[PDB]
From Swiss-Prot:
Domain SH3: 143-205
Gene: PPP1R13L
Source organism: Homo sapiens (Human)
Function: Regulator that plays a central role in regulation of apoptosis and transcription via its interaction with NF-kappa-B and p53/TP53 proteins. Blocks transcription of HIV-1 virus by inhibiting the action of both NF-kappa-B and SP1. Also inhibits p53/TP53 function, possibly by preventing the association between p53/TP53 and ASPP1 or ASPP2, and therefore suppressing the subsequent activation of apoptosis. Is involved in NF-kappa-B dependent negative regulation of inflammatory response.
Domain of life: Eukaryota
Subunit structure: Interacts with RELA NF-kappa-B subunit and with SP1 via its C-terminus part. Interacts (via SH3 domain and ANK repeats) with p53/TP53; the interaction inhibits pro-apoptotic activity of p53/TP53. Interacts with TP63 and TP73.
Domain statement: The N-terminal region is required for cytoplasmic localization.
Subcellular localization, as worded in the UniProt entry: Cytoplasm; Nucleus
Tissue-by-tissue expression: Highly expressed in heart, placenta and prostate. Weakly expressed in brain, liver, skeletal muscle, testis and peripheral blood leukocyte.
Lineage: Eukaryota, Metazoa, Chordata, Craniata, Vertebrata
Ranges in a coiled coil: none
Pathological association: Arrhythmogenic cardiomyopathy with variable ectodermal abnormalities: An autosomal recessive disorder characterized by life-threatening dilated cardiomyopathy in early childhood, with or without features of inflammation on cardiac histology. There is also a variably expressed ectodermal phenotype, including wooly or wiry hair, wedged teeth, xerotic skin, and dystrophic nails. Cleft lip and palate and corneal abnormalities have also been observed.
Name of the protein in its database record: RelA-associated inhibitor
Repeat region (ANK), residues: 44-76, 77-109
Family: Belongs to the iASPP family.
Length: 207
C-alpha cells in the first residue's frame, strides 16, 4: 500500500463516468456540480448518460436528463442514448429520452440503423419497446400541430430545402411524400422546403 503516491487533481469526468456506470447517485450529483459540462465525452464518445443507461441506473438517468445531459450525444459508433436504451428493450428510458428531446430517426454510423431496429426480439419487453418507438416514429409531424424541435443547425444545399437553427419549432406539412423517405416538407417563418427527419425531436431539449 505504501508505494503509490496520491493524485492532487483527480478528473471529475473519470469519477462521473464510473459512478454513472456502477450506480452511485450521490457521487454523480457532486461530480456534476464540480465541472461545467455533465455531457463531456471520454475518448470513445461515451457520456455519463450512456453509462447510466447501460448500468440500468434509472435514478441517475432521471437526474442526468433533468440536469441537461445531451440526450442525442453519439458514441464512436454513432449509437445515441436512445439506440443503447432500445438495445436493452428499456421502454421506460426510451420514454424519458424522447420526452427530453431525443431524435427518434437518428441513424448509426456503420449500416445506418434507427433505435427501433436495435430492439432485441429474444429479451423481455421487446413488443412494448418496439411498439413505443414505432408509435413515436408515426406520431412525429402529426402531434403538437406538426411542430417538431430542431436539435442542430441545418443549411439548405438545394433551393427546395429549409435552413433552420438549433431550438427552432418547425412545422411538418407532408411526411409520406413517396419521393423522399428521409425528408419532410415543412414550414418555418413563411418559408417551405424539405427538412431531414433525423435533425428533429418530438419534444425540445432541456437547457
Amino acid at each position: 500500500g505504501t508505494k503509490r503516491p496520491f493524485r492532487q487533481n483527480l478528473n471529475p469526468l473519470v469519477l462521473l463516468l464510473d459512478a454513472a456506470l456502477t450506480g452511485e447517485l450521490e457521487v454523480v450529483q457532486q461530480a456534476v456540480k464540480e465541472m461545467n459540462d455533465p455531457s463531456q465525452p471520454n475518448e470513445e464518445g461515451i457520456t455519463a448518460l450512456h453509462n447510466a443507461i447501460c448500468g440500468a441506473n434509472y435514478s441517475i438517468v432521471d437526474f442526468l436528463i433533468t440536469a441537461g445531459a445531451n440526450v442525442n450525444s453519439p458514441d464512436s459508433h454513432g449509437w445515441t442514448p436512445l439506440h443503447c436504451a432500445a438495445s436493452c428493450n428499456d421502454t421506460v428510458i426510451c420514454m424519458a429520452l424522447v420526452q427530453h428531446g431525443a431524435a427518434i430517426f437518428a441513424t448509426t454510423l456503420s449500416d445506418g440503423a434507427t433505435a427501433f431496429e436495435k430492439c432485441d426480439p429474444y429479451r423481455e419487453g421487446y413488443a412494448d419497446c418496439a411498439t413505443y418507438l414505432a408509435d413515436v416514429e408515426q406520431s412525429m409531424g402529426l402531434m403538437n400541430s406538426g411542430a417538431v424541435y430542431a436539435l442542430w443547425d441545418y443549411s439548405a444545399e438545394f433551393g427546395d430545402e429549409l435552413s433552420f437553427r438549433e431550438g427552432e419549432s418547425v412545422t411538418v406539412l407532408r411526411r409520406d411524400g413517396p419521393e423522399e423517405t428521409d425528408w419532410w416538407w415543412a414550414a418555418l417563418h413563411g418559408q417551405e422546403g424539405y427538412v431531414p427527419r433525423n435533425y428533429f425531436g418530438l419534444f425540445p431539449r432541456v437547457k
